[PDB]
């Protein structure tokens, strides 16, 4: 049995697009960072580099009520994870970290999964700031390094391609890339 | 380095006392289950056996807004977990399962930890319905069996004593903590 841990932001839920849409909506005069020019996991820091006071403006977007609830799915993500979890001898958990400002993040993520994937996937959510203490064969995540208290995690990190990591170990280019072969490589 | 997974309900947060106080307050006419007569971790099913309409009444108490937020800490728990996490070569995570009815559970548990233990322990919350896929040396929990997808969890399960599990008598091969004043330091030591 292969256990796949699947991150939420940038893999199932389109955080980058939602952040940019929310930023342009609420700060329509301000410069922004086009998705194709995003570099580095931390959007706030790139905004800071664009101009210092844009850091807090972009944070105010992802800290706001509704932000996580309203993210659009990543193309192909929902179908893939449904297909994946229906494969025999395969178990999917949605493994996601909340913001340190957790107030509008934690309940909204449970509600996002419930609406987009249903109650069966709500049962498969793992919230943690340290993915290295979760046991599995693979972790699909859009962050360059995934670090924590296990120096050698049980899972192999598959980097899932997102606008901010496109320009940087196995990679999945999209959910249309061949994720079945990666799972097979663990059977 | 020893990693200790610490459950919330019945170990840090007094769920049983909160449930009974909330039931007596809202359903004062109805029969209840005294804490010392609790048996089995599913309170709702014992109420159901007492009388069928009590099952939904008691659920309404722990499904209500505020319920998890307002629970009192277990005596000694907060001091113990702070001491435990300050020990060298020791890491504590708070490893808790939300209700399937998660709406007033999930945020409230985060806020409970933030208020009673601070932001440093908020960072150490793991929410999961399957504790068996979480890696650690020990899991301290008040539930008789802890089951899930790993047939052989990495951790050893230490049963923490609560009104509903007190009647169980463990085989010599398993370990119990009677309270936070019992010798949890030795259990951790056994893993060093
Ligand atoms: O500080 C930040 N700056 C920033 O630009 N972001 C963007 C990037 C993305 O990061 C994450 C994120 C999760 C955990 C820790 C940091 C960031 P994800 O891994 O879920 O994509 O969720 C918050 C999102 O916010 C987050 C954070 C989050 C900080 P933290 O969560 O408090 O550590
Ligand atoms: O059916 C139940 N009946 C019941 O009496 N309870 C009580 C007992 C205890 O159950 C727990 C519980 C949480 C997760 C899985 C089972 C039980 P905990 O052991 O964490 O305290 O959640 C809070 C408490 O609520 C929960 C449930 C939980 C149902 P679900 O599986 O979350 O739908
Ligand atoms: Mg991510
Ligand atoms: Mg418990």
Swiss-Prot record, chain A:
InterPro entries: 5'(3')-deoxyribonucleotidase (IPR010708), HAD-like_sf (IPR036412), HAD_sf (IPR023214). It is an enzyme of class 3 (hydrolase). Its cofactor is Mg(2+). One of its GO terms (molecular function) is pyrimidine nucleotide binding. Gene3D superfamilies: Deoxyribonucleotidase, domain 2 (1.10.40.40), HAD superfamily/HAD-like (3.40.50.1000). Substrate binds at residues 15, 41, 62, 96, 131. One of its GO terms (cellular component) is extracellular exosome. GO terms for biological process: allantoin metabolic process; amide catabolic process; dCMP catabolic process; dephosphorylation; dGMP catabolic process; dTMP catabolic process; dUMP catabolic process; IMP catabolic process. Keywords: Cytoplasm, Hydrolase, Magnesium, Metal-binding, Nucleotide metabolism, Nucleotide-binding, Phosphoprotein. The keyword Ribosomal protein does not apply. It is found in: Cytoplasm. Detected in skeletal muscle, heart and pancreas. It comes from the Eukaryota. The modification Phosphoserine is found at residue 174. Its main location: cytoplasm. Mg(2+) binds at residues 7, 9, 142. SUPFAM superfamilies: HAD-like. The active site is at residues 7, 9. Its EC number is 3.1.3.-. Belongs to the 5'(3')-deoxyribonucleotidase family. Homodimer. Dephosphorylates the 5' and 2'(3')-phosphates of deoxyribonucleotides, with a preference for dUMP and dTMP, intermediate activity towards dGMP, and low activity towards dCMP and dAMP. This is 5'(3')-deoxyribonucleotidase, cytosolic type. It comes from Homo sapiens. The gene is NT5C.
């Amino acid at each position: 049995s292969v256990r796949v841990l699947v991150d939420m932001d940038g893999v199932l839920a389109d955080f980058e697009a939602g952040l940019l849409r929310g930023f342009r909506r609420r700060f329509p005069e301000e410069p922004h960072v086009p998705l194709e020019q995003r570099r580095g996991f931390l959007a706030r820091e790139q905004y800071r580099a664009l101009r210092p006071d844009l850091a807090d403006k972009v944070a105010s977007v992802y800290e706001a009520p509704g932000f996580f609830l309203d993210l659009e799915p990543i193309p192909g993500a929902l179908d893939a994870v449904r297909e994946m979890n229906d494969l025999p001898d395969t178990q999917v958990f949605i493994c996601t970290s909340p913001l340190l400002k957790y107030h509008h993040c934690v309940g909204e993520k449970y509600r996002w999964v419930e609406q987009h994937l249903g109650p069966q996937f709500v049962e498969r959510i793992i919230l943690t700031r340290d993915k290295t203490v979760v046991l599995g064969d693979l972790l699909i995540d859009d962050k360059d390094t995934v670090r924590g208290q296990e120096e050698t995690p049980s899972w192999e990190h598959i980097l899932f391609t997102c606008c901010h990591n496109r320009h940087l170990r196995r990679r999945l280019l999209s959910w249309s890339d061949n994720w079945r072969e990666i799972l097979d490589s663990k059977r």
